[PDB]
From a paper:
[name] is a non-allelic H3 variant expressed in skeletal muscle and brain in mice. [name] contains 12 amino acid differences, at positions 13, 40, 53, 58, 72, 83, 124, 128, 129, 131, 132 and 134, as compared to H3.3. [name] formed a nucleosome core particle (NCP) with histones H2A, H2B, H4, and the 145 bp Widom 601 DNA. We determined the structures of the nucleosome core particle (NCP) containing [name] by cryo-electron microscopy, which revealed that the entry/exit DNA regions are drastically disordered in the [name] NCP.
Author numbering:
A (entry chain E): 48 to 132
B (entry chain C): 16 to 109
C (entry chain F): 25 to 101
D (entry chain D): 33 to 124
E (entry chain A): 55 to 132
F (entry chain B): 20 to 101
G (entry chain G): 14 to 109
H (entry chain H): 32 to 124
Write the structure that this text describes.
DNA sequence: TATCTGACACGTGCCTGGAGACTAGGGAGTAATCCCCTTGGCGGTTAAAACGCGGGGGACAGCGCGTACGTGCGTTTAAGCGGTGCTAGAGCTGTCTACGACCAATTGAGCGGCCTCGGCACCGGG
DNA sequence: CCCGGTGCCGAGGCCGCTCAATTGGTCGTAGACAGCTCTAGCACCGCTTAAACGCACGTACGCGCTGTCCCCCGCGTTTTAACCGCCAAGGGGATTACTCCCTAGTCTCCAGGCACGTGTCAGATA
């Protein structure tokens, strides 16, 4: 609750930068070797991914609340992904 | 100018150069850029009104992304318009 | 690699998302989901880039890729 | 050499909230938002033109496109001010 | 399900469409094809809605869809 | 000629058949009114855009293509009508 | 063969595609090979979807394809379904 | 009043694939609308690519990249293969 | 199950979109250069994360009771067919002309640097 | 932290260079308007019967409750790499200039496409 209010109040990014950058680069390497990413583009992916993720958890929480539970579960995320399409 | 001719702050000429360049149609009507510039002026005016209100409520004289995010998400119509929109550093509604 | 998304990071994310209690499997599921989402966005961004015969993904590349996903991103020129 | 709407957004800011500033980061958001809305309306109007097989994007096209993209009351005010400006432009 | 024959009655649906239009601008006509297209779109949309509502109901370990389910589906559809 | 409350024209058996096609088995009574509301909202939205299209084209007759375009606005592309 | 489609060994009309591209104001100029490529893609996709439609009709022992079959094919194939998952088919029905 | 449609070509492709199989008028109409829809979507994407790269002409390259974007993985790959093959075949003559 | 049939398949006739040749120009391919951002590597701090433990709030199961929904039967309503008759409006063509495209010529608005200044936070003492 | 002064640095004003907006005029034609025409829609009328409405019933499901058991949360402690700032260099994005090559455009030529007229079998009709 306190953490919920604290984080929802601010707009600082949550995922540590360098790890996320390494993730993005790993995926890109999987697609096509020796690509380069501007720090700006990695930041853009950071923002988009974090916002998307946040929305996903919002929907998952809605589903869990609907199911009378309080603890989200993989089932909830499956449902949120499915309905939204 | 032309914007002056219409009292709009937005660049009629700029909008007109864009309508032509972006190949939206063979030709472009004379009043079309005027109308479109006025519309853009109105929409930005509404966004900025709400942002300034939020900043005042937040005790800040300089607007920042979070303020835009709040303004957009709070207003029903705008939120409907920008529902698919994610704002850099926007944060989320409390 | 993917596991760089620390459990606590997901906890913070969900907190911002309003969640209050989270099951253990949530972490792995979220990790996989985000992996898929990125895979998609980066595929599209890399394609945009390759078409421009460039070697460096650019912020605009990602912006368009998200635009295709119905994910308009503001604040990147 | 690059374009933007930043200065015009700033002028609007002074029009509406004389005593308020805006972060460059926020000006970027404002600029991209204007670009997005402009592009949406323009493409919408282009389709209106092609759809009825006319080669001219006249004010009428933009009016209907706005009436389509925006929600109800926002569309009402938008069309109001747009038509008003168009009239004035012809007046002078 | 096995078939595709329309499910909402034609004429009542037509009168519904006309009534709705009556609140936008009077004396508008509708090509029978337009009415058919609207009916097909509504049928598909409602079938999708009920599929989603059924998913939600199963999720809640219930069997009887309830308006709460519909609300949930509409909301998660963003 | 006037019109009235034709929303009820979507009779309970109609909605029940709809849900059946959707795989639902058991339906609460409260559903019927809610579904009637949702359908009304959906039609309001689509018809608003279709009528706008027609008005722009200086016509008095909503054509199937007009509804098709309106649906496309909603992002619900429709086939089989041109 | 004078017709470009024949030159490319495609049943679709290359010339029609080119005309549409120019007339549809997608760009000022249209590459010579662009209509060729696009027509090839369109023919491929139509052939693909019709493959599954015909197979479904065979399963239904029907010589003629009908919207029911097209709906079946689109919904059953994961890829097409993803491509056309946001679509509605006149009298399409839905998968059991 | 002449009116365009791909019904003839769709019918031809049907003969190619399921030669012993007919098609209803409604199904043909659906196919016609489907072809128009994808043609339009690919053309729009190619146009946006052109204008993104500040290039004034839609070449084969743009359509290729557009197909790679719109279509899903396996379909995209197969279509790209088919398209490049057809372009090569055409340029050969 | 004929049969018929009109829905698909088939011929023919027209013609209109498509194709080929030539031209010219500007648009795109190429290279050459400039220089910036990108990576990469290190060391230092330290906040961030990783791990363990304890308990307890919450998920899950089972049970019991009530009741709202599915089923059926009988009764009622209007949806559908046709059918028939009228015309408002779509569509198509023909005419005119007001409006937009090009371009030549001029001007100051906008762009970017330059400076400067205090609002909001840095900074250095309480 | 506070706290006044710093400062700084992002806002904000100013400067000047300018190149894109403005303006004029011309010419073309897209678009406006009118006239005709012919369907496609509307209504209305009667009829039929299929569908819908309502009643009654009972029972399967929702819902509340309990009661367990255990999976997360919070805390503490220990480990880590994320961030940092620097610096080095170098790959490529940006910019420009130049060439040739492709495509719009035209004329000109004609045959596949499409409509319309016609035959005939897969499936609907009988």
């Amino acid at each position: 609750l306190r953490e919920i209010r604290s984080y929802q109040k601010s707009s600082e990014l949550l995922i540590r930068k360098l790890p996320f950058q390494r993730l993005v680069l790993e995926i890109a390497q999987d697609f096509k070797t020796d690509l380069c990413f501007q720090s700006a583009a990695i930041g853009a992916l950071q923002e988009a991914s974090e916002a998307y993720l946040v929305g996903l958890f919002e929907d998952t929480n809605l589903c869990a609340i609907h199911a009378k539970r309080v603890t989200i579960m993989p089932k909830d995320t499956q449902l949120a992904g499915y309905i939204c399409r | 100018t032309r914007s002056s001719r219409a009292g709009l702050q937005f660049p009629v000429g700029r909008v007109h150069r864009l309508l032509r360049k972006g190949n939206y149609s063979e030709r472009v009507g004379a009043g079309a850029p005027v109308y479109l510039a006025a519309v853009l002026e109105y929409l930005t005016a509404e966004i900025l009104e709400l942002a300034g209100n939020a900043a005042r409520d937040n005790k800040k004289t300089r607007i920042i992304p979070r303020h835009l995010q709040l303004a957009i998400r709070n207003d029903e119509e705008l939120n409907k318009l920008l529902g698919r929109v994610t704002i850099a550093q926007g944060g989320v509604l409390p | 690699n993917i596991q760089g998304i620390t459990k606590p990071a997901i906890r913070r994310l969900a907190r911002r998302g309003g969640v209050k209690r989270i099951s253990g499997l949530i972490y792995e599921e979220t990790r996989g989901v985000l992996k898929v989402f990125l895979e998609n966005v980066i595929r599209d961004a890399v394609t945009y880039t390759e078409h421009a015969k460039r070697k460096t993904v650019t912020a605009m590349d990602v912006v368009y890729a998200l635009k295709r996903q119905g994910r308009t991103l503001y604040g990147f020129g | 050499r690059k374009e933007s709407y930043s200065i015009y957004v700033y002028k609007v800011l002074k029009q509406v909230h004389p005593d308020t500033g805006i972060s460059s980061k926020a000006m970027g958001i404002m600029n991209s938002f204007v670009n997005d809305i402009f592009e949406r309306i323009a493409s919408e109007a282009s389709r209106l033109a092609h759809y009825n097989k006319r080669s001219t994007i006249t004010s009428r096209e933009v009016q209907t496109a706005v009436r389509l993209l925006l929600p109800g009351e926002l569309a009402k005010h938008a069309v109001s001010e747009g038509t008003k400006a168009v009239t004035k432009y012809t007046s002078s």
